[PDB]
Amino acid sequence: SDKKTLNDNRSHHDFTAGEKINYSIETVVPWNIANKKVYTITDNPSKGLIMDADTIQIEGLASNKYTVKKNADNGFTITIPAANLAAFAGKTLKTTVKGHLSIEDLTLIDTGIPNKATAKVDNEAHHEVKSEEVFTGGKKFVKVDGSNQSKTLAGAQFQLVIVKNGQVVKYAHGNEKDGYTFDTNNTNVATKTTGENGQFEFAGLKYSESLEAGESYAVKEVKAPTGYDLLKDPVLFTVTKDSYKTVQAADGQKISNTKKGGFLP
Q: Which residues bind Na ion (CB under 5 A)?
A: 25, 27, 93, 95, 114-115, 131, 134
Least distance in angstroms from the C-beta of 208 to Na ion: 21
Least distance in angstroms from the C-beta of 72 to Na ion: 19
Nearest residue (CB) to Na ion, 6 versus 219 = 6
Q: CB count, 10 Å around CB of 112? A: 12
Least distance in angstroms from the C-beta of 69 to Na ion: 16
Least distance in angstroms from the C-beta of 202 to Na ion: 22
Residues linked to residue 106 through DSSP beta bridges, in sequence order: none
First-to-last CA distance in the chain?
Answer: 76
Q: Which helix (H) or strand (E) holds 93?
A: strand 92-101
Nearest residue (CB) to Na ion, 115 versus 159 = 115
Per the CB < 8 A criterion, the answer to whether 66 and 78 are in contact is yes
Least distance in angstroms from the C-beta of 220 to Na ion: 32
What whole-number distance in Å separates Cα of residue 5 and Cα of residue 23? 6
Nearest residue (CB) to Na ion, 56 versus 255 = 56
CA angle at 153 for the pair 151 and 158, rounded to the nearest 5° = 135
Nearest residue (CB) to Na ion, 109 versus 219 = 109
What whole-number distance in Å separates Cα of residue 63 and Cα of residue 58? 8
Question: Which phi and psi (to 5°) does residue 108 adopt?
Answer: -85, -15
Please identify the residue of the shown chain whose CB is closest to the bound Na ion. Answer: 95
Nearest residue (CB) to Na ion, 85 versus 134 = 134
What whole-number distance in Å separates Cα of residue 220 and Cα of residue 218? 7
What whole-number distance in Å separates Cα of residue 46 and Cα of residue 74? 9
Per the CB < 8 A criterion, the answer to whether 216 and 259 are in contact is no
Least distance in angstroms from the C-beta of 97 to Na ion: 9
Nearest residue (CB) to Na ion, 95 versus 152 = 95
